[PDB]
Write a protein that binds this ligand. Sequence first.
Ligand SMILES: CCCCCCCC/C=C\CCCCCCCC(=O)O
Length: 132
Amino acid sequence: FVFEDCGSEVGKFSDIIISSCDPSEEKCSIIRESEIHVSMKFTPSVDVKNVEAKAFGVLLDVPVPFPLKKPEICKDPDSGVKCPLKKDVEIEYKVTFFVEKATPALSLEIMWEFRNEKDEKITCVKFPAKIK
Ligand SMILES: CCCCCCCC/C=C\CCCCCCCC(=O)O
């Protein structure tokens, strides 16, 4: 599968790594009852004062918004990212989350965005996943 760019206007990403899956697969396997480690290498094209992350699961061609626990990336002590972000400098975001047993097993497209304080997209990543 491909970590597709779903449109960003104030940055780009170069690499996404999800511990439970490899891009050689048809869909990204997300294992329940396990810790998932996610990394993104990205570069803002402008100086960024604050970052708010957004996630969506695609259903019926419509991206449905899903709540994140720590959307203010720069204020999360474990993210590895400190604001302000400098223009043209590649940095890396890190996050670990645990997928509960109570998580339904399904296949869906995931859309994941980092926005700045101005609600402009720094990154937009889209990929197919299978929770299994
Ligand atoms: C309930 C299971 C959720 C399904 C797993 C989604 C997998 C997508 C992988 C990476 C993009 C999401 C990154 C956000 C990490 C969550 C941390 C948080 O709650 O802020």
